[PDB]
C-alpha cells in the first residue's frame, strides 16, 4: 500500500535529542500535538514543537 501525503506541504523536523532539522519530508497527518511525516521510507511521529510545516 502506499500513504499518499497531504498535497502541498513540506516538513523540516527535529529527532530527539538532535539540534539539526531533516527534511525535506511529506506531510501524512496533522494531529492536535504532534504530525505524522514520511521522509524516504521512514514514516515517523514529530511533536509539533520539533516540526517545521512549511506551506508549498
Ligand atoms: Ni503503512
Same mark, same amino acid.
Given at each position: 500500500?502506499?500513504?499518499?501525503?497531504?498535497?502541498?506541504?513540506? !516538513?523540516?523536523?527535529? *529527532?530527539?535529542? +538532535?539540534?539539526?532539522?531533516?527534511?525535506?519530508? =511529506?506531510?501524512?497527518?496533522?494531529?492536535?500535538?504532534? !504530525?505524522?511525516?514520511? *521522509?524516504?521510507? +521512514?514514516?515517523?511521529?514529530?511533536?509539533?514543537? =520539533?516540526?517545521?510545516?512549511?506551506?508549498?
Amino acid at each position: 500500500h502506499h500513504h499518499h501525503h497531504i498535497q502541498n506541504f513540506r !516538513v523540516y523536523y527535529r *529527532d530527539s535529542r +538532535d539540534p539539526v532539522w531533516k527534511g525535506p519530508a =511529506k506531510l501524512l497527518w496533522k494531529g492536535e500535538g504532534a !504530525v505524522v511525516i514520511q *521522509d524516504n521510507s +521512514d514514516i515517523k511521529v514529530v511533536p509539533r514543537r =520539533k516540526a517545521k510545516i512549511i506551506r508549498d
